[PDB]
Amino acid sequence: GQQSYSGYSQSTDTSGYGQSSYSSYGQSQNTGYGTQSTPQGYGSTGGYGSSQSSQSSYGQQSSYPGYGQQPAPSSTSGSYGSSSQSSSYGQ
Amino acid sequence: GQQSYSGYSQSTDTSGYGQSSYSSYGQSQNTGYGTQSTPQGYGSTGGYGSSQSSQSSYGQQSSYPGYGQQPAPSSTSGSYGSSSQSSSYGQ
Amino acid sequence: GQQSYSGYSQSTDTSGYGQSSYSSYGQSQNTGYGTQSTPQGYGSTGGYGSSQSSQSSYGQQSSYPGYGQQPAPSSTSGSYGSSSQSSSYGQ
C-alpha cells in the first residue's frame, strides 16, 4: 500500500483577536503518478518576463516585444505585498 | 508500504492577539512518482528575466526583447515585501 | 517500509502579542521518487537575469535582450524585504 498526501498546503487558521493577511502568486502542485508542465512569464512596472519550452518538437520559436518603443514621461506605482504601501510623485 | 507526506508547507497559525503577514512567489511541489517541468522568468522595475528549456527537441529557440528601445524620463515605485514601504520623486 | 516526510517547511506560529512578517521567493520541493526541473531567471531595478537548460536535445538556443538600448533619466525605487524601507530622489 502506497500513499502520497500533499494536503493542506498554504492553509491558514485564526482565533481570539488574530489578524492575518496572505498573498500568493503562482503555486503548482503535482501528486500521484501524472505529468505536469506549466511555464510562466511575469512582468511588472516596466520589466519584461519571458519563458519558452519544447518537448520532442521540430519547430521554431522566437520572441521580441517592445521593439524600438518610446513611451512618454510617466508616473506609476504598484503595491503587491500584503499590508505594504507605495507612493509616486513627479515634477 | 511506502509513503511520501510533504503536507502543510507554508502554513500559518494565529492565536491570542497575534498579527501576521505572508507573501509567496513561485512555489512548486512534486510528490509521489510523477514528473514536473516549470520554467519561470520574472521582471520588475525595469529589469529583464528570461528562461528557456528543451527536452529531446530539434528546433531553435531565440529571444531578444527590448531591442533598441528608448523610454522617457519617468518616476517609478514598487513594494513587494510584507509591510514594506516605498517612495519615489522627480525634479 | 520506507518514508520521506518533508512536511511543515516554511511554516509560522504566533501567540500572545507576537508580530511576524514573512517573504519567500522561489521555493522548490521534490519528495518521493519523481523527477523535477525548474530553471529560473529574475531581474530587478535595472539588472538582467537569464537561465538556460537542455536534456538530450540537438537544437540551438540563443538569448540577447536589451540590444543597443538607451533609456532616459529615471528615478526608480523598490523594497523587497520584510519591513524594509526605500526612497529615491532626483535633481
Curated annotation (Swiss-Prot), chains A, B, C:
The modification Phosphoserine is found at residue 9. Ubiquitous. Residues 1-42 have a biased composition (Low complexity). It is found in: Nucleus. Phosphorylated in its N-terminal serine residues upon induced DNA damage. ATM and DNA-PK are able to phosphorylate FUS N-terminal region. Coiled coil: none annotated. Transmembrane segments: none annotated. It is linked to A chromosomal aberration involving FUS is found in a patient with malignant myxoid liposarcoma. Translocation t(12;16)(q13;p11) with DDIT3. A chromosomal aberration involving FUS is a cause of acute myeloid leukemia (AML). Translocation t(16;21)(p11;q22) with ERG. Self-oligomerizes (via N-terminal region). Oligomerization is essential for chromatin binding. Component of nuclear riboprotein complexes. Interacts with ILF3, TDRD3 and SF1. Interacts through its C-terminus with SFRS13A. Interacts with OTUB1 and SARNP. Interacts with LRSAM1. Interacts with SAFB1 in a DNA-dependent manner; this interaction tethers FUS to chromatin. Interacts with MATR3. Interacts with SNRNP70 and POLR2A; these interactions couple RNA transcription and splicing. Belongs to the RRM TET family. DNA/RNA-binding protein that plays a role in various cellular processes such as transcription regulation, RNA splicing, RNA transport, DNA repair and damage response. Binds to ssRNA containing the consensus sequence 5'-AGGUAA-3'. Binds to nascent pre-mRNAs and acts as a molecular mediator between RNA polymerase II and U1 small nuclear ribonucleoprotein thereby coupling transcription and splicing. Also binds its own pre-mRNA and autoregulates its expression; this autoregulation mechanism is mediated by non-sense-mediated decay. This is RNA-binding protein FUS. It comes from Homo sapiens. The chain holds residues 34 to 124 of 526 of the full protein.
